[PDB]
Amino acid sequence: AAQTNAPWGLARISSTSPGTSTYYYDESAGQGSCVYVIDTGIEASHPEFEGRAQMVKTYYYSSRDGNGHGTHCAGTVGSRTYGVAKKTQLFGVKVLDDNGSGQYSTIIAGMDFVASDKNNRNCPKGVVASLSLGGGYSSSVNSAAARLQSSGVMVAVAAGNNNADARNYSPASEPSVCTVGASDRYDRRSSFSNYGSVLDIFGPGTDILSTWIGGSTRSISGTSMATPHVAGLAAYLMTLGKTTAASACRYIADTANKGDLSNIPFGTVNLLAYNNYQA
């Protein structure tokens, strides 16, 4: 399948070269997979989600996304126009308030929730969790992310936005999950992207158009935007049967475009997520 005039990041993840604008993908499109977006919520009523999104947990007085960040990330995972995996099921877990803030205890609870809740959901092709959040190093946060991964969920986490080594951030620094840095449309490391040996992969993160609250759209930047590209890619590849939750991060690294990014610090992987689709 081909989506013309797609957002640059979708085109990039289906290309061996920058500078193209069509997204190519197998029409299975993540059908039968599930992606949990652990964030500020998801505006599930957005036409772009086509009934495939739903809130399943909140730790606040409402499940509404009053911020937009979670809706944007979910849109990159699985919205019809802006999403990698256009037929996946999206589950919202609101661990962040409408200012984008949350206690680590709440974030940990949301991760443990997903590890259990996936047993209440029909996801025959596999389960992914997208975590576009983080803060300073916490062994407890890292342990929760490791538990979620171990339970059989492909965990993609943002490297962080401090132009610093991700070893000092959580859950970015947990080795067993998939830690995602950000690149721009000219194949440069995004100016803010964290780096370091703990990174597994880069995805598009600068100037990413996706869904927003109020039935709207906007372009924003961050490792938060790169992470759902990788999460959606994992769901797409799991639906194709090419990999599993336990092996998807390694598979994405194995099949990535290699050596194509600039300003990658020595010791950080030079790997850009790629779907290897051949029509």
UniProtKB/Swiss-Prot annotation:
EC id? 3.4.21.64
Where in the sequence is the active site? Answer: D39, H69, S224
Q: Which UniProt keywords apply?
A: Calcium, Disulfide bond, Hydrolase, Metal-binding, Protease, Serine protease, Signal, Zymogen
Q: Which residues form the Peptidase S8 domain?
A: 7-279
Q: List the disulfide bonds.
A: C34-C123, C178-C249
What chemistry does it catalyse, as a reaction equation?
Hydrolysis of keratin, and of other proteins with subtilisin-like specificity. Hydrolyzes peptide amides
GO annotation, cellular component aspect: extracellular region
What's this protein's name? Answer: Proteinase K
Organism, by scientific name, is: Parengyodontium album
What part of the full protein is here? Answer: 106 to 384 of 384
